[PDB]
Swiss-Prot record, chains A, B:
Keywords: ATP-binding, Kinase, Magnesium, Nucleotide-binding, Transferase
Native source organism of the sequence: Pseudomonas aeruginosa (strain ATCC 15692 / DSM 22644 / CIP 104116 / JCM 14847 / LMG 12228 / 1C / PRS 101 / PAO1)
Binding site for ATP: 114, 151, 184, 211-214
Enzyme Commission code(s) on record: 2.7.1.35
A biological process from GO: pyridoxal 5'-phosphate salvage
Record's protein name: Pyridoxal kinase PdxY
GO MF assignments: ATP binding; magnesium ion binding; pyridoxal kinase activity
Family: Belongs to the pyridoxine kinase family. PdxY subfamily.
Entry-linked Gene3D superfamilies: 3.40.1190.20
Length: 288, 288
């Protein structure tokens, strides 16, 4: 059995429930990744409850922690950096500094950026300096950029007419530097109302993944965090682009099926773990 | 399949490597526990490297976080509280306040205290107010108290002549309130030099567990954290005292075997995970 990959995950932490690192870390470890969790905040619970308690790490604590890891000579063992929601451009910059430092120590390290500008329940909830930093700075250094449709539309300053337009939008982002664009959640006029769709676009290839949309009274939080981390993990474990894409789609569906069957608002990560590791159902990606 | 237990784990976090919550959380989730990780610190790496970076949570942030969970109405779902190393008596008190609040919301909740006063590599490294708080306050409310021999000897103000004396020492701690005393690491005159031994003592019963001591150039950190969390998890999953005890012994040995076979200083938790969930070898406890 080959060496276990190492991944530095720089996101929110919640004590109860699942969001950010609390949505991603356990699933990635479960499928064979040594995760280094750098928690950018510690809250009681995620913000979508409309109430929470906790303090946010000042952004300088991010490169300080990485400096500590450099101090024990371990930074070269890091195979990837993963980021998600950012509370400020200052936090974003601290993350990019850490990405550059890790790439210095290991030139093969990957950076995956999950740009978060809001959620479908509300709209854009991020300051212009955050959305501007994501496009102008993070996208310029990210190996993999993983927007939802909201961020895709903002990045491109374009609203799609069709699935074709979403494909061209993702393609147009490649000119910025990333080797692939994962659109983790599609929304375009004429998309079937009962379907959850994803796109993966590289210069090489374009893939469309379709699965049934599950009904919930309240949209569970951290699905994007889960998808991003699993996708990156699969790539570190040697999957090609299409197989990482299909695994992610299949594993996220298992979590959601378990979450739904339990009547839970929080993702049933522990209960569904065997089906994260080995999903029963595999939805095939279609080439565009 | 029965409901997944919930456990609040209130300990240190390290970004790289394994100690405190970073030694315990993943293994407990892996065997079927929903863990609520409340990180009392976030350091770059554990302190036994002799260098590290990070800030410590002020102790008032502990009941504040739990207050947040109460605010979303979830505190009653907590089945256990787990603590380990304490940086101050003030931190200890905040943990006990949280234990009392949880026991109010769920009278069946268990508190397991892993009292940490040092490690065998050095000696006692904790202030008298910490070691005094552990005995006088934590032991008075803990359902399960899990000392190493160092803490057993300090608590009893007694040095053992034999294994028999260690048994009587553990027994004498029951008068303080705990339903069982797990001595996670035994050391007494005449113990075989190549053996790792544990005791579990309840009013009911006394068990001795023996396994081979593995050779390492540097003692791996977090073995006690791993053992405490697995033990408690097994009890939440319905094991009796002897079976929780034997599972813990077996699962910790698998991690150590993988850690040793890799030539690693840090615990190989991810690599060994299938053998945490289902240990190959089971060492039988012997009744005393
Ligand atoms: Mg997200
Ligand atoms: Mg310990």
């Amino acid at each position: 059995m080959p060496r276990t990959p190492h991944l530095l995950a720089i996101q929110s932490h919640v004590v109860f429930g699942h969001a950010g690192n609390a949505a991603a870390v356990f699933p990635m470890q479960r499928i064979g990744i040594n995760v280094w969790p750098l928690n950018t905040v510690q809250f009681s619970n995620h913000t979508q409850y409309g109430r929470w308690t906790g303090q946010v790490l000042p952004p300088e604590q991010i490169p300080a922690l990485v400096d500590g890891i450099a101090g024990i000579g371990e930074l070269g063992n890091c195979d990837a950096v993963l980021s998600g929601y950012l509370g400020s451009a200052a936090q974003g910059r601290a993350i990019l500094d850490v990405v550059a430092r890790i790439k210095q120590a290991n030139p093969r390290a990957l950076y995956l950026c999950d740009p978060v500008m809001g959620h479908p329940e509300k709209g854009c909830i991020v300051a212009p300096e955050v959305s501007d930093f994501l496009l102008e700075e993070a996208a310029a250094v990210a190996d993999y950029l993983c927007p939802n449709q909201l961020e895709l539309d903002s990045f491109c300053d374009r609203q799609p007419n069709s699935l074709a337009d979403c494909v061209e939008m993702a393609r147009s982002l490649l000119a910025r530097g990333p080797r692939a664009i994962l659109v983790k959640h599609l929304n375009y006029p004429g998309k079937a109302g009962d379907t959850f769709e994803m796109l993966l676009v590289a210069a090489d290839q374009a893939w469309h993944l379709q699965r049934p949309l599950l009904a919930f009274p309240r949209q569970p939080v951290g699905v994007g965090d889960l998808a991003s981390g699993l996708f990156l993990s699969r790539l570190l474990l040697g999957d090609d682009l299409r197989n990482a894409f299909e695994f992610t789609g299949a594993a996220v569906h298992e979590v959601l099926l378990e979450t739904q069957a339990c009547g839970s608002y929080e993702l049933e990560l522990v209960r569904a773990q065997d089906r994260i590791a080995h999903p029963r159902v595999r939805f095939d990606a279609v080439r565009l």
